[PDB]
Amino acid sequence: LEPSSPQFVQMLSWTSKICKENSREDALFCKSLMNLLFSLHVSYKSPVILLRDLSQDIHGHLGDIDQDVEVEKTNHFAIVNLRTAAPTVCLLVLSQAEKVLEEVDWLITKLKGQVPNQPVEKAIIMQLGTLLTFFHELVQTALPSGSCVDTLLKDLCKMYTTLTALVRYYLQVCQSSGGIPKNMEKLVKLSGSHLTPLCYSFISYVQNKSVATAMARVLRETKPIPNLIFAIEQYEKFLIHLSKKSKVNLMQHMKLSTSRDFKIKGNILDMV
Amino acid sequence: QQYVIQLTSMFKDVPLTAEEVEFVVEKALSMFSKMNLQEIPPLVYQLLVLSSKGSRKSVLEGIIAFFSALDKQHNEEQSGDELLDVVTVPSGELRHVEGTIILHIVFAIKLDYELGRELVKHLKVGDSNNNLSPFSIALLLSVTRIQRFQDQVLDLLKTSVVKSFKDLQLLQGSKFLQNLVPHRSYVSTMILEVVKNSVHSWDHVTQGLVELGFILMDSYGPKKVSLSRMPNQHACKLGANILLETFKIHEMIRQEILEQVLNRVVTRASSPISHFLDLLSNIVMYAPLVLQSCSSKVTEAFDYLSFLPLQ
Amino acid sequence: LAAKVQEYHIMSSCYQRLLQIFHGLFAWSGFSQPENQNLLYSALHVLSSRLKQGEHSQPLEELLSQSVHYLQNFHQSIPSFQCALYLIRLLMVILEKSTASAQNKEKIASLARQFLCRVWPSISNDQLHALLCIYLEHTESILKAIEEIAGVGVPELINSPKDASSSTFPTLTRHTFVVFFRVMMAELEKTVKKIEPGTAADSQQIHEEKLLYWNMAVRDFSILINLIKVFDSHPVLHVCLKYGRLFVEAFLKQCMPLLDFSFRKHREDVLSLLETFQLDTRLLHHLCGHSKIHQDTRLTQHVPLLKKTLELLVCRVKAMLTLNNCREAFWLGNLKNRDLQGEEIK
Amino acid sequence: QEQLLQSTFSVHYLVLKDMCSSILSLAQSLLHSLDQSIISFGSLLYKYAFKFFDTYCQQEVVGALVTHICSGNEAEVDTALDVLLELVVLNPSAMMMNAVFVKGILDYLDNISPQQIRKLFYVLSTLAFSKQNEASSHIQDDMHLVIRKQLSSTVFKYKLIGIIGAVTMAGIMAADRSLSDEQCTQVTSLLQLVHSC
């Protein structure tokens, strides 16, 4: 189908209507259906609203990490069931978000190599501000400790690297001393007050609750959390650079970075 | 607007600094449109033989940008009904002055490698590298006649075309990104137009063109013996198109293209050779053309046919 | 002149230039080839003759050492600091001719300390760095020398009239302290880096020796960072914040396996070692936060990599705990952020 | 090592001479390195290739060395010039007939640093003053006119090049060997001419 017709629109409407209606136990059927829906919807507009209002429903079924929060589940999609949400849907929506970040980063590097930079900045800011609600929504979920949490950490590091690329571009632009409008200010303040502290609160839960190939597997585990911490600190450093350039300050909105120190117990005596 | 040819005598003997020579080369760039089309190559020779002891990036950049802009304007306003229409300088003059100027630039680069190194570093690509143009592509293709710059320019061209096809495959895959940006001429059609434009009696780019075609075909052949396959298949298709296109237009080179294709396809290695076979079938469609030039390589290919396996 | 200044200032420069000529002559690549070994022997004979001649034919070791003892006699009286550094360099290039270096590496270091402790009445930071690098490497038990310099640096700050920095090291001031800090931390990193554990196949004595050496190293590292509290200026803070990351990377890379192997036999020592290092890493975190509290690009440039290779240590400690089948013993928790002096910022 | 290549070019020269153009291309490609061992190896490759092969390949060798000299990069210039010097002192008679190509360098005297000009004049002079040339000594009496037309010029730079060349050629012309003839009178005449100019 050519992606401009009443038939294309009605087909996409029909697939969305099924995805909003029924409940099915199989994980393969739902995953294929979601791939179909994203393949249709990715060429008619950006799916960044769908990811938000799908992960907001995912967040309901699993639960928060604080152990004392009364979620509402919002029943957006009936096909994202209890046995459906944990190992299948979250991994797929993370992959789709990674694709969206790839598109945004290509746009940023193209537009930085360009030097019509007035509306494209607004569009990129809109997409970042939308999917940051997605990330803030599924950070606090009590995801299974398998590969899904590792995928989430990798994609969150990718998100931060993209956002520092944007901040670097604004450093390259604000040599005119007036290139920090309100649409960036809301994005930076919201990123300060929604995503960054919740990253640390999530890392606490990830770390706290649990031959030679065993050693290789053990060393394979230790990468993503340091990679994420390095990306965050790089982000704050380049934000400090931008604040020093154009005489405004941005570190007012986001608090001081908390820090971690391992402890130990005398419970190894139980082992012997 | 008449003594500019002798305006270069002021920068020959006396030492100067960068600011004044940059100002005078900016003036020269501004008056390229004013003077004439035909008078340019002697002025280019004078400025470029002056440029050894002074400014070297500015003159080359100005020439490249001016001729890219002129080619772009002529191409955009050339399209129309085959009837009376507005046009600037005709193709037969433009391609000839471009050929003389590119040959002069290649000679000057051969006189000192620093100019060539500056040119190569100037056109470095991931990034869009918007300075790429049919004129600049022809330039990079003609510098390959020097042994110092061959691989250093062919690898740049290869990565450039791969980046362009990746950009196309990314841009066609979404609506939002397709909604925001206007399309730019991707470098596939740029080279595919350079090869067609090369009919106008200059042959100093054919060797670079065939070498690029063979490199670009070999490096991205189907080695099956999924996303990155699509650029890796469009690249091979472009290579086949380029090779078949240079086969028909230019005569002196068609003896070696078929020899290389045969020498690369008649093997016992059992490596996947589908694309080379398709190219060979395409370029033996013009049967008499092969018989005129190279009717010997097929003969000793036939004499070796007894040894190969059945498939 | 133990008991008008134009001649003194001229002869001082002449004395420096002369040993510069000697060092330039005695340190060219031609002596590597054996063609001019006879020329080298003849020159060494010319040097050594002035002590006690009478034997043209001699073993190489004997007249080499006799010439060295001749040149060492000039440490009795030299007028400058450049001259002392040049004399040390010339002795350095001469002594490497001898194959054995059991005593030479100690006599050079002792003479270097004798020069450095000399008051040198009037010195520039570009040369004191080289001299202290020469002194610090050549002593055996590097950690002992580092700790001794740290323990004699406090007689400066405890009681000093302003700019009267006469410690028991009379070339330790408030203007040249950063050079001492830089070379001290760099030498500590270099001597830590070259240790290697392997396979746990050695006896218990080897493992206990390596643990004792590491305990001394981390104790000295803590006492070397702890006194940046009183010396808070831009370059000293920068150099500590860089080479502390370097040392933590070395400690994680080289001697985490040695921590892995001997958890069974020695569990009480390693836990205390980790707590002792935890205190220092806590103060390093306080430094990292203080670097971004006051915006300063040149000092904040290094904090991302520091934070990465300082969370790497916590996660690798968890990995070590899981390697010996003790996953349940791990327990995390945040920490209260403090200033350099130590407070509770809000 | 190098005795390996010596044996290579000594025993199998008849078979290896078929593809000498490819050999020269390989030497040209590998001469563009940065170290000294590779450059020396390519230099001796050129030398041995000129030593054994056919006259056409000798012309190709001297052409490649000329374009190396006129290329411009300093290490290439010094290496190629030293190669030419040792090549002309090795086989003067074979190099004698190819003097046109090496003289043709003299048209490009802005791509060469002042110090290398003395070496170029030295190698050209010792080429043009072997007694095998006395049968038809044309290069010598051509260069005595080239130097004159360089010195009688008005551009200062060519006058400096002329004095450098005149001195370094008179040195070889009056060289002490194992003479006191009319060549000494010619040396004297050249010196008083270049002093008056």
Curated annotation (Swiss-Prot), chain B:
This is Fanconi anemia group I protein. It comes from the Eukaryota. It is found in: Nucleus; Cytoplasm. The C-terminal 30 residues are probably required for function in DNA repair. Belongs to the Fanconi anemia group I protein family. Plays an essential role in the repair of DNA double-strand breaks by homologous recombination and in the repair of interstrand DNA cross-links (ICLs) by promoting FANCD2 monoubiquitination by FANCL and participating in recruitment to DNA repair sites. The FANCI-FANCD2 complex binds and scans double-stranded DNA (dsDNA) for DNA damage; this complex stalls at DNA junctions between double-stranded DNA and single-stranded DNA. Participates in S phase and G2 phase checkpoint activation upon DNA damage. Homodimer. Part of a FANCI-FANCD2 heterodimeric complex that binds and scans dsDNA for DNA damage. Interacts with FANCL. Interacts with MTMR15/FAN1. Interacts with POLN. Interacts with UBL5; the interaction promotes FANCI homodimerization. Deubiquitinated by USP1 as cells enter G2/M, or once DNA repair is completed. Monoubiquitination requires the FANCA-FANCB-FANCC-FANCE-FANCF-FANCG-FANCM complex. Ubiquitination is required for binding to chromatin, DNA repair, and normal cell cycle progression. Monoubiquitination is stimulated by DNA-binding. Phosphorylated in response to DNA damage by ATM and/or ATR. Phosphorylation of FANCI promotes ubiquitination of FANCD2, which prevents DNA release from the FANCI-FANCD2 complex. It is linked to Fanconi anemia complementation group I: A disorder affecting all bone marrow elements and resulting in anemia, leukopenia and thrombopenia. It is associated with cardiac, renal and limb malformations, dermal pigmentary changes, and a predisposition to the development of malignancies. At the cellular level it is associated with hypersensitivity to DNA-damaging agents, chromosomal instability (increased chromosome breakage) and defective DNA repair.
From Swiss-Prot, chain D:
It comes from the Eukaryota. It is found in: Nucleus. Monoubiquitinated on Lys-149 during S phase and upon genotoxic stress by FANCL in complex with E2 ligases UBE2T or UBE2W (isoform 1 and isoform 2). Deubiquitinated by USP1 as cells enter G2/M, or once DNA repair is completed. Monoubiquitination requires the joint intervention of the FANC core complex, including FANCA, FANCB, FANCC, FANCE, FANCF, FANCG, and FANCM, and proteins involved in cell cycle checkpoints and DNA repair, including RPA1, ATR, CHEK1 and BRCA1, and is mediated by FANCL/PHF9. Monoubiquitination prevents DNA release from the FANCI-FANCD2 complex. Required for maintenance of chromosomal stability. Promotes accurate and efficient pairing of homologs during meiosis. Involved in the repair of DNA double-strand breaks, both by homologous recombination and single-strand annealing. The FANCI-FANCD2 complex binds and scans double-stranded DNA (dsDNA) for DNA damage; this complex stalls at DNA junctions between double-stranded DNA and single-stranded DNA. May participate in S phase and G2 phase checkpoint activation upon DNA damage. There is a cross-link at residue 149 (Glycyl lysine isopeptide (Lys-Gly) (interchain with G-Cter in ubiquitin)). Belongs to the Fanconi anemia protein FANCD2 family. Homodimer; cannot be ubiquitinated and does not bind DNA. Part of a FANCI-FANCD2 heterodimeric complex that binds and scans dsDNA for DNA damage. Interacts directly with FANCE and FANCI. Interacts with USP1 and MEN1. The ubiquitinated form specifically interacts with BRCA1 and BLM. Both the nonubiquitinated and the monoubiquitinated forms interact with BRCA2; this interaction is mediated by phosphorylated FANCG and the complex also includes XCCR3. The ubiquitinated form specifically interacts with MTMR15/FAN1 (via UBZ-type zinc finger), leading to recruit MTMR15/FAN1 to sites of DNA damage. Disulfide bonds: none annotated. This is Fanconi anemia group D2 protein. The gene is FANCD2. The C-terminal 24 residues of isoform 2 are required for its function. It is linked to Fanconi anemia complementation group D2: A disorder affecting all bone marrow elements and resulting in anemia, leukopenia and thrombopenia. It is associated with cardiac, renal and limb malformations, dermal pigmentary changes, and a predisposition to the development of malignancies. At the cellular level it is associated with hypersensitivity to DNA-damaging agents, chromosomal instability (increased chromosome breakage) and defective DNA repair.
